[PDB]
């Protein structure tokens, strides 16, 4: 079927097919457009028009200009083939390697885990980084929002995690550059190239990356947001995967749909939301989880927008988050990447009675102790060390030696560290905390405790000086 | 219908014919088998690790002598 | 046959302008051509606005709209108490198919102050400082305020395994089936909850409404007053019937929307107003009947979660000002662990009464006084200030008795046990004991006594109200006990 | 532990049945569609029943 | 006359009569409705449709279905039946006694009073309570309004002034539960059979009782206001009576306004409130008065959604009033009950003619100190406390005695209190402000003029506290 230009404003085609009606979110492409001018149907106005979304720039529209429905959403490459790619959002690549080559493709839409396929109560995804299975352990299959220093190798944390993770257990990656700019995509591709987890010459390119920037039109950078959860599915329940799924910044993505929303003639709603805005994401979360198939897991870099969170959007996305990651420049201050904060490195299903204790208590023996340290540090920033009870200097210095614990090197940036780095096995991470808690190793050098891997790394670090 | 109980008859015909037989599974090849394989592997693990047609043995304990 | 069918005037926005079949019934839920319902809102002349329950992805222009001819009702039944539906009332649970064959309107009215009676009843939510703090009876609205899983949702799932006993009892009278509507929470969240509930199985006296966090906005609206329907039939079974709606600000989201997208505007916090209308109908379907209704009740315990706190918030006035009390629960405690989180001071039930035994008055006149009191000096007194040794103890027994109310996530109980235990701290058997350890002393005292003194337990529950004798008995049982909690 | 063994044969079979009910079954009804101008007669029978709807509705 | 539902976009029921087009406030009945489904006719919509108001649920509706226009508005029965009845906005029982049967009938529309028929100047009432009075020196026949926020203790203190007040003054009263929360209404109801207030044996039975709650559509809430104001006006002037209008709340008449404005075609303009929003509700509470045959005392509850006073609503509804009760949702949550802002809760009939000096100055001392006080608050809030004036932290606890001592404990909700509540004849009152005031008290402990009544007893409350 065709359809005509018979309406531009900007990017909101109003095409009339002029003997189509094929449903909302059936892909069109333009015709007498070279260039993949997809539009994405919006809306069936009647007349058996449409208003639909350009989703590729509008130039030279001729009116009346030809359009052919491609009559489903976009169909995409979905395949293995894909991890070494950057496609832009439409799938196509921008990595320019000639096409992807998948044949395996899929409509862009996909649907929510329903209770039937569920795997009912979740999982956590361990990293075997201290910091994370911690204080925030992961869910497999969960989202987790990264609030998080900038340009501090928060990338580079991420790709250490993709490192420890999506290698040992056989997880992949896709990468959703929501808002990115050419710019950050270029330093992540580099990133990759360089760190060679992105490998344009082996599959250890462990990642797919799909761009949908700033740069393009609305609908793209919104609709971004459900391919890139389309490939996931792809992986996830063809391969099986354990996914894990970075969309990077989903705001901008929420964003965007605000934008539309206006632009859809749609009142978005006060503080410029979609009214929608929950369900879109509703609807997006619910897609993203955890069944009988494997669990996208969803690491999502997420601004603090505005630094306000009054604004619904994050405030609806506490529901989205289970587990939180606030990474912290205090951390990083203090020297320490991993430079994570704890106490914000939490996870609203991390709770005790629904996860539990071990890391709550053990951990809220640590975070109290660091912050009772705290406490202290304000008294001790005054008087110094010397006035309080000894117990508390232990504590001190435990907790710093826990702290220092913390610092672990990485494998991915030997270029920062001129270290390899290091994970840490979870029951190690802990039982090392109980050393330390214990106060065993409170006569051993504490920063020895410092960049090191396994807790017993940090003895072996201690006993070589003394 | 009954001209639509036409159909149903077909079904039924077809259904016999594979269970007293089957060719992979009769309309399936391969492609059923291989699927079973990556759902049974997932749900060993729910299920626990092995005995799964044979029945479990058990062991018994001990003390110290005070 | 196109005598029962129209084509879609025009869709766009899951908005289905309808063309034709003016022979619409007002209310009606109409069957789009998908397995999709609407509803016939808004007859216009020319259009019928049918609001889509589902989506027009799934749809077409000019499509064909098909009366169903029906004004909206639900499937009703008792059989649902053992399955988890959604809003059209099919399982979503996906069990077999619901039991229920009946069918029953949605948009009953809640009936009249004749068609009703007051509450005498109580309820049991096993939770101390509820069951106790607000006591609540049945009909009785009150609002659950509270944030992420402070437990916010735990609490609910308490107290409905806390019902469990009573489906696992003889109070039929009291038997409480528990509606759950799930409004928002994602499959996984409920995924588990549900399956929480089904390990309790707590689900034979339960229906979960299950409109996730994904939905068609229109069916998370309607999931409320679906749910509503099917206890509203429970209540008017006689039964008792406790309807969690969680939570209608989230409904009231996905209405706005509708609203807006029905290009109806709002008024004050951008929302229209009407949901208030909505759920004040839909709230005041919770209510105690009198007995015509076999002295029916539907108690409500709606929930809004709160954000901020902002009370000041319309939306949370509004419900204020229909519920009969809240449950304000706050988080810091949470953080402080402290799960009932709850702040009592902002927490309310104006009934309260109703819903009480002179076991608990006995012991809870005293001691939601004592905590006031305590509170206050909590909130004055001392914490870099003063040291009056009044308030002080004040003080040290209320901190033992704030211990005491705290509960743990997953930890409902029998009233008895509670009042026991209460009873101790209230007449201060404790302050000579440091605050955890009384947690560690309940658990044992408790093992104990419902091992032997389960005849004096069994005593109280039986007369409902501590004796004089059980006192000392219980004193003694305590004392000793606690005595032997030290030694 | 007893359990465990049986009721994953069970489950397994269960699934498999209904893998092959509709792999049968899209496979049976997407071939065999076809005969509907062959016996129109269906569409005889609609107009048959569908006099006595034009006449046995009212 | 016959009318055609041409459009039901919800309640709005959008008629064309093609049989003429009467008048609006044209009452119309639905034909072929289960429920006797009033519209009132409130814009011919042009070529013979009108715009309607169903007021009752929207059910079975064809569209077509036709209305045979009732030709005038709903008329109920009025004049002493009700009293002792519950009915419903339709002028129709819910009492669940049948038929009302005092047939004097009327439009629930009623006009404005004159300027000749108002009586003219109205004269301090009152009512014991302290606080009240203090504030709110109560004027005989006024239009009081509770500016309240969300039932707290609100309803309680409503009924807390029924109780102690509405019992006290004996001669009928009319309550209007508009969108009232009909479990209240029930316990109330229940309590007035309970009390005798309401009996089953007599329309001595003092109140008539009025509902049209809030599982109503907005037609009906919107409107039952009118209905019990043609009533209260029956007895009013008919009848003389000091009618004792109740209305819990306005706001929902008002909220039922707003909401239909959009749908009304209008702009529901700032707030979402209406743009007739003062015109409505002015000529409704111009409506309400003491004419020269009578009193109708509104005591008319004052939704304040969020309790934003700022808000054109209130705003408005300050233009009306006579004695405004202000909750103070600071004071309340505090604990107090009574839960009052008392330097906004005022009756403009301040007077030391009226109110005699004594009262007046005593209050416009104490109005002052308090005032005082209140920009000591802002004070101490910032600045800690203690290098002030001592004179000012005299005050501050005095006046935290005075606040203590305007509390009251609640003498019909002892199930709120476990205590009774109390009353204060006036001159204990002023006399007890004048004698803290005094600094009689005051070289004690602030504790005990908390929750009390007389002032002599919160001395003597001070004596067992002094131990």
């Given at each position: 079927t065709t359809g005509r230009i018979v309406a531009v404003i900007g990017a909101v085609v109003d095409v009339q097919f002029d003997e189509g009606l094929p449903p909302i979110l059936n892909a069109l492409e333009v015709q007498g457009r070279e260039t993949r001018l997809v539009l994405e149907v919006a809306q069936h106005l009647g007349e058996s028009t449409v208003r639909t979304i350009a989703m590729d720039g509008t130039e030279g529209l001729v009116r009346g200009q030809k359009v052919l429905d491609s009559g489903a959403p976009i169909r995409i490459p979905v395949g293995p083939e894909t991890l070494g790619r950057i496609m832009n959002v439409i799938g196509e690549p921008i990595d320019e390697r000639g096409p992807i080559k998948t044949k395996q493709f899929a409509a862009i839409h996909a649907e929510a885990p329903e209770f039937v396929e569920m795997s009912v109560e979740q999982e956590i995804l361990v990293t075997g980084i201290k910091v994370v299975d911690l204080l925030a352990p992961y869910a497999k299959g969960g989202k987790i929002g990264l609030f998080g220093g900038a340009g501090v190798g928060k990338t580079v944390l991420i790709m250490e995690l993709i490192n420890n993770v999506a290698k040992a257990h056989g997880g992949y990656s896709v990468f959703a550059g929501v808002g990115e700019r050419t710019r950050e995509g270029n330093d992540l591709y580099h990133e990759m190239?360089?760190?060679?987890?992105?490998?344009?010459?082996?599959?250890?390119?462990?990642?797919?990356?799909?761009?949908?920037?700033?740069?393009?039109?609305?609908?793209?950078?919104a609709r971004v947001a459900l391919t890139g959860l389309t490939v996931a599915e792809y992986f996830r329940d063809q391969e099986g995967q354990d996914v894990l799924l970075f969309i990077d910044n989903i705001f901008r993505f929420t964003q965007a749909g605000s934008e539309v929303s206006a632009l859809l003639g749609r009142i978005p709603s006060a503080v410029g939301y979609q009214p929608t805005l929950a369900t879109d994401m509703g609807t997006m979360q619910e897609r993203i989880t955890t069944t009988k198939k494997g669990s996208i897991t969803s690491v999502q870099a997420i601004y603090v927008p505005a630094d306000d969170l009054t604004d619904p959007a994050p405030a609806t996305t506490f529901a989205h988050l289970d587990a939180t990651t606030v990474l912290s420049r205090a951390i990083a201050e203090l020297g320490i990447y991993p430079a994570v904060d704890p106490l914000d490195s939490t996870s609203r299903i991390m709770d005790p009675n629904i996860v539990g204790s071990e890391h709550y208590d053990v951990a809220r023996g640590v975070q109290k102790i660091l912050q009772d340290y705290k406490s202290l540090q304000d008294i001790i920033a005054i008087l110094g060390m010397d006035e309080l009870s000894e117990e508390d200097k232990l504590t001190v210095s435990r907790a710093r030696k826990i702290q220092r614990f913390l610092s672990q090197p990485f494998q991915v940036a030997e270029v920062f560290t001129g270290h390899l780095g290091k994970l840490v096995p979870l029951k190690e991470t802990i039982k090392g905390f109980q050393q330390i808690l214990a106060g065993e190793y409170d006569h051993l050098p504490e920063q020895a405790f410092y960049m090191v891997g396994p807790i017993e790394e940090a003895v072996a670090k201690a006993d070589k000086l003394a | 219908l009954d001209p639509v109980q036409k159909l149903f008859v077909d079904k039924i015909r077809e259904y016999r014919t594979k269970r007293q037989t089957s060719g992979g599974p009769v309309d399936a090849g391969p492609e059923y088998q291989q699927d079973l394989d990556r759902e049974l592997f997932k749900l060993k693990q729910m299920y626990g690790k092995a005995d799964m047609n044979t029945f479990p043995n058990f062991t018994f304990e001990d003390p110290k002598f005070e | 046959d196109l005598e029962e069918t129209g084509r879609v005037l025009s869709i766009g926005d899951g908005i289905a302008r309808v063309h034709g079949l003016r022979n619409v019934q007002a209310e009606e839920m109409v069957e789009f051509s998908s397995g999709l319902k609407g509803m016939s809102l808004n007859l216009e002349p020319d259009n019928v606005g049918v609001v889509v329950f589902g989506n027009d992805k799934l749809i077409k222009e000019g499509d064909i709209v098909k009366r169903t001819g029906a004004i909206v009702d639900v499937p009703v039944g008792e059989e649902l108490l053992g399955r988890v539906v959604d809003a059209l009332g099919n399982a979503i649970d996906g069990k077999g198919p619901i039991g229920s064959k009946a069918r029953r309107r949605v948009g009953l009215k809640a009936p009249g102050i004749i068609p009703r009676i007051s509450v005498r009843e109580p309820m049991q939510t096993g939770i101390k400082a509820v069951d106790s703090l607000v006591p609540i009876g049945r009909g009785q609205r009150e609002l659950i305020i509270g944030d992420r899983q402070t437990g916010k949702t735990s609490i609910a799932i308490d107290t409905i395994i806390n019902q469990?006993?009573?489906?696992?009892?003889?109070?039929?009278?009291?038997?409480?089936?528990?509606?759950?509507?799930?409004?928002?929470?994602?499959?996984?969240?409920?995924?588990?909850?549900?399956?929480?509930?089904?390990?309790?199985?707590?689900?034979?006296?339960?229906?979960?409404?299950?409109?996730?966090?994904?939905?068609?906005?229109?069916?998370?609206?309607?999931?409320?007053?679906?749910?509503?329907?099917?206890?509203?039939?429970?209540?008017?079974?006689?039964?008792?019937?406790?309807?969690?709606?969680?939570?209608?600000?989230?409904?009231?989201?996905?209405?706005?929307?509708?609203?807006?997208?029905?290009?109806?505007?709002?008024?004050?916090?951008?929302?229209?107003?009407?949901?208030?209308?909505?759920?004040?109908?839909?709230?005041?379907?919770?209510?105690?009947?009198?007995?015509?209704?076999?002295?029916?009740?539907?108690?409500?315990?709606?929930?809004?979660?709160?954000?901020?706190?902002?009370?000041?918030?319309?939306?949370?006035?509004?419900?204020?000002?229909?519920?009969?009390?809240?449950?304000?629960?706050?988080?810091?405690?949470?953080?402080?662990?402290?799960?009932?989180?709850?702040?009592?001071?902002?927490?309310?039930?104006?009934?309260?009464?109703?819903?009480?035994?002179?076991?608990?008055?006995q012991v809870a006149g005293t001691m939601k006084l004592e905590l006031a009191q305590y509170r206050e000096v909590a909130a004055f007194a001392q914490f870099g200030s003063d040291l009056d040794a009044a308030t002080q103890q004040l003080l040290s027994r209320g901190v033992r008795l704030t211990e005491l109310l705290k509960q743990g996530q997953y930890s409902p109980m029998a009233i008895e046990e509670q009042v026991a235990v209460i009873y101790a701290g209230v007449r201060g058997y404790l302050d000579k004991l440091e605050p955890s350890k009384i947690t560690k002393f309940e658990n044992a005292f408790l093992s104990h006594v419902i091992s032997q003194h389960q005849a004096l337990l069994g005593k109280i529950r039986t007369d409902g109200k501590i004796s004089e004798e059980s006192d000392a008995k219980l004193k003694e049982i305590v004392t000793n006990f606690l005595a032997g909690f030290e030694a | 532990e007893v359990k465990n063994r049986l009721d994953?044969?069970?489950?397994?079979?269960?699934?498999?049945?209904?893998?092959?009910?509709?792999?049968?079954?899209?496979?049976?009804?997407?071939?065999?569609?076809?005969?509907?101008?062959?016996?129109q007669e269906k569409e005889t029978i609609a107009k048959c029943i569908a006099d006595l709807k034009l006449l046995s509705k009212k």
């Open positions: 190239i360089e760190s060679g987890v992105i490998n344009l010459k082996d599959a250890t390119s462990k990642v797919a990356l799909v761009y949908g920037q700033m740069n393009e039109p609305p609908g793209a950078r | - | 469990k006993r009573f489906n696992d009892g003889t109070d039929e009278k009291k038997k409480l089936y528990c509606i759950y509507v799930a409004i928002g929470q994602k499959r996984s969240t409920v995924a588990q909850l549900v399956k929480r509930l089904t390990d309790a199985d707590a689900m034979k006296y339960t229906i979960v409404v299950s409109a996730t966090a994904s939905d068609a906005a229109p069916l998370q609206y309607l999931a409320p007053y679906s749910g509503c329907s099917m206890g509203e039939y429970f209540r008017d079974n006689g039964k008792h019937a406790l309807i969690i709606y969680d939570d209608l600000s989230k409904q009231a989201v996905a209405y706005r929307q509708m609203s807006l997208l029905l290009r109806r505007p709002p008024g004050r916090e951008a929302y229209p107003g009407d949901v208030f209308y909505l759920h004040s109908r839909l709230l005041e379907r919770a209510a105690k009947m009198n007995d015509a209704f076999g002295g029916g009740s539907l108690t409500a315990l709606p929930v809004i979660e709160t954000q901020a706190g902002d009370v000041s918030a319309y939306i949370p006035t509004n419900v204020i000002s229909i519920t009969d009390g809240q449950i304000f629960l706050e988080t810091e405690l949470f953080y402080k662990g402290i799960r009932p989180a709850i702040n009592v001071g902002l927490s309310v039930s104006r009934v309260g009464s109703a819903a009480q035994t002179r076991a608990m008055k | 994953y044969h069970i489950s397994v079979q269960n699934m498999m049945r209904q893998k092959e009910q509709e792999h049968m079954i899209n496979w049976v009804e997407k071939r065999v569609v076809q005969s509907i101008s062959a016996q």
